[PDB]
Amino acid sequence: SGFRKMAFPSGKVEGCMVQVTCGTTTLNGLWLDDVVYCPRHVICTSEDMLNPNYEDLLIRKSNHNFLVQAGNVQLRVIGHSMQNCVLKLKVDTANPKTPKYKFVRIQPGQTFSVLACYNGSPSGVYQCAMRPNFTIKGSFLNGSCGSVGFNIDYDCVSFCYMHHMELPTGVHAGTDLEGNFYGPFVDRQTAQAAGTDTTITVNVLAWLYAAVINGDRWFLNRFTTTLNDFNLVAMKYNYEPLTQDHVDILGPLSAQTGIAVLDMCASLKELLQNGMNGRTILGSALLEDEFTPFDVVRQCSGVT
Amino acid sequence: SGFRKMAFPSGKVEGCMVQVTCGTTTLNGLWLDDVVYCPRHVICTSEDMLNPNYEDLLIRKSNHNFLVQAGNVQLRVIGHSMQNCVLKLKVDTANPKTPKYKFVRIQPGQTFSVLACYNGSPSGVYQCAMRPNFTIKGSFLNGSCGSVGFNIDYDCVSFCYMHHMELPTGVHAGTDLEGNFYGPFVDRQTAQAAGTDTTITVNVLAWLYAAVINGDRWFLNRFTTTLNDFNLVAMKYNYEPLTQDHVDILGPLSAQTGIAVLDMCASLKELLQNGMNGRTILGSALLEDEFTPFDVVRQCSGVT
Numbered sequence: 196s197g198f199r200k201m202a203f204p205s206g207k208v209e210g211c212m213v214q215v216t217c218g219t220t221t222l223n224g225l226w227l228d229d230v231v232y233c234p235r236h237v238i239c240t241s242e243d244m245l246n247p248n249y250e251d252l253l254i255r256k257s258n259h260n261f262l263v264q265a266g267n268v269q270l271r272v273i274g275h276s277m278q279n280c281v282l283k284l285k286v287d288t289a290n291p292k293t294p295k296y297k298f299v300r301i302q303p304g305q306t307f308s309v310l311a312c313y314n315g316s317p318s319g320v321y322q323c324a325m326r327p328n329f330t331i332k333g334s335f336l337n338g339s340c341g342s343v344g345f346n347i348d349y350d351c352v353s354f355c356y357m358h359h360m361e362l363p364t365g366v367h368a369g370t371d372l373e374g375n376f377y378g379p380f381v382d383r384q385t386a387q388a389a390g391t392d393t394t395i396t397v398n399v400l401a402w403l404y405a406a407v408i409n410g411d412r413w414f415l416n417r418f419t420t421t422l423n424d425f426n427l428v429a430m431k432y433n434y435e436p437l438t439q440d441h442v443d444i445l446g447p448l449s450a451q452t453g454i455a456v457l458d459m460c461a462s463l464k465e466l467l468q469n470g471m472n473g474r475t476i477l478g479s480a481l482l483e484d485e486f487t488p489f490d491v492v493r494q495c496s497g498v499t
Numbered sequence: 500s501g502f503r504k505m506a507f508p509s510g511k512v513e514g515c516m517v518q519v520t521c522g523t524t525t526l527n528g529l530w531l532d533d534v535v536y537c538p539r540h541v542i543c544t545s546e547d548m549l550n551p552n553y554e555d556l557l558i559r560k561s562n563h564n565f566l567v568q569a570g571n572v573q574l575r576v577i578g579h580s581m582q583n584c585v586l587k588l589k590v591d592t593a594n595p596k597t598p599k600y601k602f603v604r605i606q607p608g609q610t611f612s613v614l615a616c617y618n619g620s621p622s623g624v625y626q627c628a629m630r631p632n633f634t635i636k637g638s639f640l641n642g643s644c645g646s647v648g649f650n651i652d653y654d655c656v657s658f659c660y661m662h663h664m665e666l667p668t669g670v671h672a673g674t675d676l677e678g679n680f681y682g683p684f685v686d687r688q689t690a691q692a693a694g695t696d697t698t699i700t701v702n703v704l705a706w707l708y709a710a711v712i713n714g715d716r717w718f719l720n721r722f723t724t725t726l727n728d729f730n731l732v733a734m735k736y737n738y739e740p741l742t743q744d745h746v747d748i749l750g751p752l753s754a755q756t757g758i759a760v761l762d763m764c765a766s767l768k769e770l771l772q773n774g775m776n777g778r779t780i781l782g783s784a785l786l787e788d789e790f791t792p793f794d795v796v797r798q799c800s801g802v803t
């Protein structure tokens with residue numbers, strides 16, 4: 196029993212992290228097969244970042260200007276290309292520790308583990324969600340760019356995120372591993388305001404089911420609701436709308452606990468309207484939205 | 500910027516996890532050099548667990564009764580001994596992935612990462628604290644016993660915990676890697692009530708400093724206090740007493756932020772007396788006590 200904000204074991208990803216230096220800029224790269232993936236802003240001075248023309252900056256760069264270090268061994272760069280906002284450095288050595296992997300573009304509300312790295316070296320691992328405004332709330336200091344977000348399905352790492360940017364409001368923006376930003380963000384030091392950080396309703400409901408499964412039941416009430424009624428209350432509280440797709444996804448948890456999804460919606464409705472009155476659910480004083488329904492089933496069943 | 504509940508990268512520990520089977524019981528073992536460490540209750544039926552005589556149960560066991568599997572390869576057991584509440588299975592092969600390591604017995608309030616494992620296979624990693632009542636609040640299903648808690652200092656894994664027990668109240672109890680329980684707990688299925696789960700005051704203060712460093716400053720007030728005055732309020736709120744040792748440990752964070760420790764105590768005092776009034780600190784609606792001062796400095800500086 197017990198329910199924790201749990202990251203994927205990071206070993207398979209630790210084995211892929213390298214240091215990339217271009218001039219005076221050092222950040223992290225991801226070494227998969229004979230390609231190293233890193234943010235294209237590795238080629239920028241902090242001055243460049245105000246208004247960079249990446250194509251023009253890149254013309255001035257040769258293979259030998261990209262210093263790639265894996266542990267304390269240098270990799271030989273034999274090619275480089277820009278794909279969207281990432282550089283692909285071709286090296287002459289396939290990473291011997293390359294796991295089975297995929298590049299996936301996640302949807303808002305989807306969760307993933309981040310391996311925070313500095314100078315190609317892992318500092319820690321934590322669990323994130325892609326926010327509905329396509330920001331993440333991470334822990335990223337200077338040097339952390341090129342740190343990656345991932346899911347693991349048994350032995351296959353799905354890479355979904357590479358860290359590029361802290362917005363002036365201290366939230367985080369990055370790309371998939373094709374170098375396309377999540378949301379409307381750009382790799383430029385400019386006014387970039389995030390939109391409304393709404394609560395991921397389906398995730399909150401999953402976590403309420405996790406709470407019931409783990410003995411925290413005080414918030415269960417005698418009420419039910421409808422999707423339309425619930426959604427009026429959700430809108431008012433800056434909660435994402437709940438769809439029949441979300442109800443379907445919660446079916447297995449509904450089944451396991453014998454609490455109909457719409458009954459759990461009615462519990463959530465009362466919690467929104469009445470608050471926690473100083474009580475906690477799974478050691479939280481607020482409604483937790485960084486567990487997917489899949490996360491709750493995985494952790495409640497013990498998948499490896 | 501940003502501050503996350505962050506675990507150590509788990510790769511070095513993933514490389515040490517094996518499956519141990521004795522009869523119908525499968526749990527996890529830790530393979531370091533040519534020794535596999537596992538909970539001695541691997542030799543118990545669920546019936547045995549009501550009132551086990553471990554010495555008598557062990558007499559009936561031979562090396563060949565301990566099935567040790569590392570990935571899909573069997574290890575040959577060439578010796579076995581009981582040390583306190585752990586078994587040490589001597590195997591004929593040193594673990595090739597053995598990291599530099601130490602066995603440490605942590606104090607209450609100290610934090611560590613758990614690698615949750617089932618059948619010798621990692622499912623996830625999360626950050627814990629040893630509670631002042633010598634319980635931990637983990638995520639441990641059946642099969643998770645032998646999962647370990649650790650700290651990493653650069654390249655040296657300090658193992659501090661091995662999972663043994665869920666108490667009837669759903670909190671967790673285990674041993675150091677010499678097999679000595681934290682607190683008064685025993686590996687017997689019996690009435691074992693935890694004492695008062697007090698808040699780790701020095702950790703809350705560290706996290707308030709982390710909040711200031713990360714721009715969350717709304718709780719800073721115009722007041723100061725004394726250790727004795729603060730401690731009267733702490734006692735009332737089931738907070739651990741604050742000692743001059745704790746004040747000293749917070750010195751570097753005091754220095755960095757220019758907030759005297761006793762001023763931060765006076766902020767914490769008001770938060771205890773007034774509550775959060777529906778506000779959050781680093782995305783928490785309650786005062787977080789699972790970051791040590793060392794944790795806050797590590798994460799705020801980017802140690803790898």
Ligand SMILES: OCC1(c2ccccn2)CCCC1
Binds near residue numbers: 670
């Ligand atoms: O399940 C919720 C938690 C718990 C509570 C009691 C026992 C064990 N675990 C609290 C915070 C995260 C883990």
Ligand SMILES: OCC1(c2ccccn2)CCCC1
Binds near residue numbers: 331365503782
């Ligand atoms: O620092 C606190 C958190 C944050 C908030 C804003 C931006 C980035 N990170 C919220 C929860 C954990 C991370």
